[PDB]
């Protein structure tokens, strides 16, 4: 088909048809029949307007103005100008040709059958406001006015179309030739009574029927209406511009400094800085989690065989006995021989997670009749002050440990300079954050959530024991299989994915909770035994906690591995900005330093109230830890606070660059930000750090 199009027509005609039809906002390839029709129509109208010419008085020796082919905007404005200059009605459809003699717009068309019916239906479509000439492949012609075209033009057009018709059937193209009326089948659209009434009752105040609105829109000249409306508008409608200044900015959410409010609890799913993995060196083979947990407990047999618990702390509502018996059942199941990791002593599991205390649903009619059934008030989040453990979390998760848990596959050889730059950036990033404790915590988190999601494949009405395991590698190359504790997941009879399935997790730790009583108001902790590392006894506690999460939360935890890409993108944006200051890449220079440049240093934190600098590696580690904490501590409060602190930070930046920022309703922004600082540890610590950094910027801007 397309070959016929490019062979039977000149390149200019094909290009004009293609660019005029591509404005339909659709694929021009899969439907080329209309392309052929439009090309033939363009050729016909071009031929029609190449033989007859006019003069100062109208000597026949141009007379035809071509509107099709040109851009629709230019064509429409030209048609409107012609109609205005000639004092004639403008056709509602874009006429394909205009005549200077008759002072009327005209249309052309191509068909396959008799042209009389086509002409009559086109007349019905356009009424009598436009003239037409029509030709058909089967030697038929129709003209509204016999004084429109001469014999030469009609004969040439007829010969061309007859030749095209004859040639089409030679390559089996006439069979697939679509007609012309199909593209304009729908021209009748009559509204029913109901829809007409709905339209009539949907007009702005001041009109009775939609006819009045239509006439008002099509007739009235509203020039100058905006000024008239604005003149009488009250002066009270003002943005109230206010130039911003350094002193205008104030600390956000000072209540967090109120010592009366309680400390923020530790609501993260898994222990991050207090983890304790029972290392068990392995060759490197992959084994089922149950076998790994069994071997790890066998190595530390003393902890496994602990039956008398030395309770150290208790939650407000949880029962220590039930949790301990559930943990004993979990370890018994882990240490058995059956392949399945399914609990068989469902008693304590059922009675420990409060799975039997759920209310029973009754028919709505009884509730309506009943008077004691009333909606319960929403438990709005409490308000808490600064929690000192978030600072320790951030400090420790950014340190370099002796083990790494990242092993990514390989990539093809790098050739292009951009590939070399990307590979260098990746090398520096991984080298910097390979052993960072945040990476290991992130891997544990994602692996545990993946296992939780997998266990929900077919087991939904049964309790499943899942060990919190991890695969780690050290500098020497020997790889270990760490076990961080266990967790039993309950049943979710409902098939919904956003339905909480209660899971209770027992994680080992080496930190005595009594040191920070406010850090664990939600944990039940025992003391199982004592490990020896360098001949010295260090205690081991078992933090037992009930929790509730849904399948979508499992998916979120699984995707929590995106913190790596997030941190890499942030570092790459920093490097791209540094390189954009210059004209060349700044990766090695800002990491290691070249002859011209020096190793870039970033302000990391505070030491005894004084600023401290550090290498770009420390900044990368802090960025990764911040991203991981943001993902782990994520709730609606955190995202809202970040979204509003965006605006506050942008205003501060504008202030720094001496751009003279102006604020309209500053207190509105401050209220929007403070609306989200209620109980999230990450949000509260972010507010504290923002206040500290704002103070530092204020005190440093006076120099």
């Amino acid at each position: 088909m397309d070959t016929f199009i490019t062979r039977n027509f000149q390149t200019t005609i094909i290009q004009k048809a293609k660019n005029t039809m591509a404005e339909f906002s659709e694929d021009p390839e899969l439907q080329p029949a209309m392309l052929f029709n439009i090309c033939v129509h363009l050729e016909v109208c071009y031929v029609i307007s190449d033989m007859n010419f006019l003069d100062e008085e109208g000597k026949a020796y141009p007379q035809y103005e071509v509107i099709e082919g040109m851009p629709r905007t230019i064509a429409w404005m030209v048609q409107r100008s012609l109609a205005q200059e000639h004092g004639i009605e403008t056709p509602k459809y874009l006429a394909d040709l205009f005549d200077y003699k008759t002072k009327r717009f005209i249309e052309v068309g191509i068909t396959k059958g008799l042209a009389d019916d086509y002409f009559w239906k086109k007349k019905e479509k356009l009424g009598n406001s436009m003239e037409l000439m029509i030709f058909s492949y089967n030697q038929d012609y129709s003209l509204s006015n016999e004084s429109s075209l001469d014999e030469e033009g009609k004969g040439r057009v007829l010969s061309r179309l007859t030749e095209l018709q004859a040639e089409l059937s030679l390559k089996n193209l006439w069979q697939v030739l679509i007609g012309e009326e199909d593209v304009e089948k729908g021209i009748d659209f009559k509204l029913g009574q109901t829809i007409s009434r709905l339209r009539d009752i949907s007009v702005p105040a001041g009109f009775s029927n939609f006819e009045g609105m239509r006439s008002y829109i099509d007739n009235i000249d509203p020039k100058g209406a905006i000024e008239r409306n604005l003149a009488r508008m009250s002066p009270l409608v003002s943005v109230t511009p206010k130039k911003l200044t350094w002193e205008d900015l104030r600390p956000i959410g000072p209540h967090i400094y109120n010592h009366e409010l309680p400390e923020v609890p530790y609501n993260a799913f898994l222990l991050m800085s207090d983890e304790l993995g029972l290392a068990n060196m392995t060759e490197g083979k992959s084994k089922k989690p149950k076998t790994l947990a069994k071997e790890c407990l066998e190595k530390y047999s003393t902890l496994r065989d602990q039956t008398d618990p030395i309770l150290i702390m208790k939650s407000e509502k949880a029962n220590e006995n039930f949790l301990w018996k559930l943990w004993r059942d979990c370890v018994n199941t882990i240490s058995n021989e059956e392949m399945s990791n399914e609990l068989q002593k469902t008693n304590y599991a059922k009675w420990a997670t409060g799975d039997g205390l759920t209310y029973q649903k009754i028919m709505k009619e009884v509730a309506i009749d009943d008077e004691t059934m009333c909606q319960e008030e929403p438990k709005i989040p409490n308000k808490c002050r600064v929690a000192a453990w978030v600072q320790t979390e951030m400090n420790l998760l950014s340190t370099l440990t002796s083990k790494r848990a990242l092993d990514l596959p390989e990539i093809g050889p790098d050739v292009a300079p951009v590939e070399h730059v990307g590979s260098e950036r990746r090398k520096y990033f991984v080298n910097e954050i390979n052993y960072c404790k945040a990476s290991t915590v992130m891997m544990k988190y994602v692996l545990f959530h993946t296992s939780l999601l997998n266990e929900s494949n077919a087991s939904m009405g049964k309790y499943k024991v899942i060990p919190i395991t991890n695969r780690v590698v050290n500098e020497k190359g020997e790889s270990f299989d760490m076990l961080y504790g266990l967790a039993v997941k309950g049943q979710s009879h409902l098939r919904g994915d956003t339905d909480v399935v209660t899971v209770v997790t027992f994680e080992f730790s080496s930190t005595d909770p009594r040191v920070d009583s406010g850090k664990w108001p939600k944990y039940t902790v025992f003391r199982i035994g004592s490990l020896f590392v360098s001949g010295r006894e260090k205690s081991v506690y078992l933090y037992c906690r009930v929790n509730g999460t849904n399948k979508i939360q499992m998916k979120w935890g699984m995707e929590a591995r995106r913190c790596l890409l997030q941190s890499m993108q942030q570092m790459e944006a920093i490097v791209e900005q540094e390189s954009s200051i210059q004209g060349y890449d700044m990766t090695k220079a800002c990491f290691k330093g070249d002859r011209v440049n020096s190793p870039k240093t970033f302000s990391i934190g505070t030491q005894e109230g004084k600023l401290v600098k550090g290498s770009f590696g420390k900044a990368l580690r802090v960025i990764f830890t911040k991203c991981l904490m943001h993902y782990v501590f994520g709730n609606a409060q955190l995202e809202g606070f970040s979204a509003e602190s965006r605006r506050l930070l942008l205003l501060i930046q504008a202030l720094k660059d001496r751009k003279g920022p102006w604020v309209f309703d500053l207190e509105g922004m401050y209220s929007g930000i403070e609306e989200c600082i209620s109980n999230n540890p990450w949000v509260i610590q972010s507010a504290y750090w923002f206040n500290e950094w704002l103070g530092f910027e204020k005190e440093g801007s006076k120099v």
């Binding site: 050739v415 080298n431 500098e475 210059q582 004209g583 070249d594 002859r595 011209v596 440049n597």
Partner: protein, 296 residues
Amino acid sequence: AAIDGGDVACDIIRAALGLKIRQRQRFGRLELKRISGRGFKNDEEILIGNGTIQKIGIWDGEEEFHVRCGECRGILKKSKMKLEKLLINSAKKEDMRDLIILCMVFSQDTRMFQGVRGEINFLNRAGQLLSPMYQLQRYFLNRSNDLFDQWGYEESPKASELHGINESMNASDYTLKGVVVTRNVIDDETEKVSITKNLSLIKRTGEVIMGANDVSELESQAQLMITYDTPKMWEMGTTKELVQNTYQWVLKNLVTLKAQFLLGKEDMFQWDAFEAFESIIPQKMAGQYSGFARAV
């Protein structure tokens, strides 16, 4: 030797090996052939638009050059801070784009100096600061609109074959001052040149004809499977290829390695192959790796 090919790197290698090369000055992609006039070199400080001062050896005196770059030809007139007149022929747009931009940079026109906005601290592959002229060359090659706007335009000559050109090499009455097109194409034999430590070609009288910074950075893959023997350059290949090559070298001469090892000296851990192999070893653990290997 057989092929009279290459642009710059081939000439440098030929001179290093002591072969016959063509005689023509180069300023990167732009090769020059002085036809008339002479000038002297004087070192002094100049002010750039961005507002920094750096010493430069400028050439003062009337000079006429047979400027060429790629396929397009032309002639250049150069004096102190002024681009008197420049004539070019018809070719691919980017060809004369590079030719004319390099002509601006080489003419040392004060307008070109004032046409710098950003920092020009560009580094080379070796990590050494580029010469100021090459720094401006690279900056303007990456930044062409700024210089073209800063230069200023004028009316084109009324000659039939002479017409102007815009920033995008579009013929127009407004043409870059001293720049014109011409349909009268100008027509486009070997000597020996000495070389120095820094891979810079210096003629018999001592003028520099081709530096080490004129090598085009256009990386590409050879159409033929070239082979090399020296291990000093194995680092260019991927890590697996480097390991394969070094282990092949170790294995093939294994008898000599064993014989020297049995002697117990330390000269057998410093072979060129081992120096090439060391590159792929991480710096932090390299010392421990070597210590453990020596101990075992």
